[PDB]
Design a protein around this nucleic acid. Structure first.
Ligand SMILES: [Mg+2]
Ligand SMILES: [Mg+2]
Ligand SMILES: [Mg+2]
Ligand SMILES: [Mg+2]
Ligand SMILES: [Mg+2]
Ligand SMILES: [Mg+2]
Ligand SMILES: [Mg+2]
Ligand SMILES: [Mg+2]
Ligand SMILES: [Mg+2]
Lengths: 51, 150, 117
RNA sequence: CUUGAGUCUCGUAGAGGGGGGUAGAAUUCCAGGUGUAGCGGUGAAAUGCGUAGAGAUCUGGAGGAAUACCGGUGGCGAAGGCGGCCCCCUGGACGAAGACUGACGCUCAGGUGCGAAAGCGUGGGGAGCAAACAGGAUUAGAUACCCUGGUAGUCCACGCCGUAAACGAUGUCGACUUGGAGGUUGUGCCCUUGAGGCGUGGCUUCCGGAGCUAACGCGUUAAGUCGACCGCCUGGGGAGUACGGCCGCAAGGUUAAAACUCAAAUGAAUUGACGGGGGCCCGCACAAGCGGUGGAGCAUGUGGUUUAAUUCGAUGCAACGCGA
């Protein structure tokens, strides 16, 4: 997640991190793990994703 | 709650005619003794307006200008924890609080007669000297010191 | 001192604290500052504002190095993750690059259980 | 005899299995550089690590474990279960044209083999995580949850243990019975100009008809309609316990009672109530304010205590200047 953007302009273009690393993944691995909780709690997102 | 009252229109100042000044008299008023109030507001509003030399409502305004808070903290019970979050005080509130503080502090100035006390506090205020201004300092310091939540 | 005029700015946006370290493009730390060390503790130290006062507080040290422009290295969630940057730039710093060096293992060590209430 | 079962040819997909390599991201540890007063942690904290220089930051090195993204309503396997990439050894499944054997089939007590995790033995390995254990905190207490550490173990080879909500809580094989939407993999055909359109096999999701069901629900992948064989149930507690046998290094597994005792135990659905469950609302409920009580003297009621008697009744909000 690189951001050089030539030419001066006080704009962070931070949105990049918010489309890959950062939270979601970081917050995911933060605390404990799952081992079995994903194949269910995570695979239960489809039971909802259906509609 | 669901209700939506507002600002109960107040009768304009008698010896003058300023709504702001009017409510200032009510704040100082007690036991529904509106007359006794005015007999104190003006007497002290004069002993001061004299020194300042300028019209009462001017020395009056200046005094308030100091004891005028711009932001204050508002208790909030969100998440089993009472977080103190500051917020800019509306225009109308600003004048009110000031007047309330001025009197509440003037009343306990240990002087001789209420009038004299009022006059003094009103002065000290016009230059961050009395307790009125003090309050605003502690209140304003409350904010920022909580700007994190702000 | 050395007059680097241009180095990097590492930002440790830990979930509890936030420290900002300025060093030349080599790695040699020129100067650093930390949120918790900048006053407020515990609860308030882990807020966005916290990191801000820290960032500026760091510049008040490395600026003596004649630092003009500098990149930005950020890693970790929590507040002051972005805040620090703004105060850093606003404090009069020719910013250029900003990268999230946040460590993301492709599944390696087992994270600690903890937190259970 | 050929339609059941199998064989051959040619493809197809696959985290199927055994062995051996190998890459990158990260953690930790060691050494050195820069740098300086904190870091770490929580609800706060504290234990802890820091001036013997931590933390951060950079460089070099060591080592173990696990493979982000892809990745899924996904795939493979008998089940357990199996995810980086590469090689070698190997098993199954499916389709297609066809060619071949000619009922060689289905099921299966006993038996044999496979069996998550934890556990056990020998010898290795040990980064991270973590029973035990030790501190710190919390609490009335806290032999816990939370924090700081941390041994077994988790990893490996070989052997043992055979259990789990080993679950679809639904045995295997076969034939029939309206539909709809979708995933995945093979295949015939058609200007595929381009994807595409007409289909036709395997595996698999969700909805649902008939019918089945106590209901919830199941519903061509049935819990519907039928056939072949098997395993199992016969009230709750006592009890998957005791005794005996067999097995096991052990922990324990497996086989399996009675005495006694109860009139229930139980499944599903229903209404309501409650939830330190969720959504949307009202009220001086809160918030915004003004004035009070709680301290003082006294009035008064109550409890208490006392009294020969202190007459009886009212006692959360809804009793206590209340019946009076
Ligand atoms: Mg622990
Ligand atoms: Mg094991
Ligand atoms: Mg062992
Ligand atoms: Mg399958
Ligand atoms: Mg259905
Ligand atoms: Mg029930
Ligand atoms: Mg009302
Ligand atoms: Mg209130
Ligand atoms: Mg009060």
């Amino acid at each position: 997640i690189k951001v050089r953007e030539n030419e001066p302009f006080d704009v962070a273009l931070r949105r990049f991190k918010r489309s890959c690393e950062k939270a979601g993944v970081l917050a995911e691995v933060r605390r404990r793990e799952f081992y079995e909780k994903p194949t269910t709690e995570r695979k239960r997102a489809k039971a909802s994703a259906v509609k | 709650r669901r209700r939506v009252i507002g600002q109960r229109k107040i009768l304009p100042d008698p010896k003058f005619g300023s709504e702001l000044l009017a409510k200032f008299v009510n704040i100082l008023m007690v036991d529904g003794k509106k007359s006794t109030a005015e007999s104190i507001v003006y007497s002290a509003l004069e002993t001061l307006a004299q020194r300042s030399g300028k019209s009462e409502l001017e020395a009056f305004e200046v005094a308030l200008e100091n004891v005028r808070p711009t932001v204050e903290v508002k208790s909030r019970r969100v998440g089993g924890s009472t977080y103190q979050v500051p917020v800019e005080v509306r225009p109308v509130r600003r004048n009110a609080l000031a007047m309330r503080w001025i009197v509440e502090a003037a009343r306990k100035r240990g002087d001789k007669s209420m009038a004299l006390r009022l006059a003094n506090e009103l002065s000290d205020a016009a230059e961050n000297k009395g307790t009125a201004v003090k309050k605003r300092e502690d209140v304003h310091r409350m904010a920022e010191a909580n700007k994190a939540f702000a | 001192r050395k007059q680097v005029s241009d180095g990097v700015a590492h930002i440790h946006a830990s979930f509890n604290n936030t420290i900002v370290t300025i060093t030349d493009r080599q790695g040699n730390a020129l100067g650093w500052a930390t949120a918790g060390g900048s006053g407020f503790r515990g609860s308030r130290k882990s807020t966005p504002f916290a990191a801000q006062v820290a960032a500026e507080r760091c510049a008040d040290a490395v600026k003596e190095y004649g630092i003009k422009n500098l990149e930005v290295m950020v890693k970790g969630p929590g507040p002051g993750r972005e805040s620090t940057i703004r105060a850093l730039n606003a404090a009069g710093f020719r910013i250029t690059n900003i990268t999230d060096v946040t460590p993301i293992p492709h599944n390696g060590c087992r994270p600690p259980k903890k937190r259970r209430v």
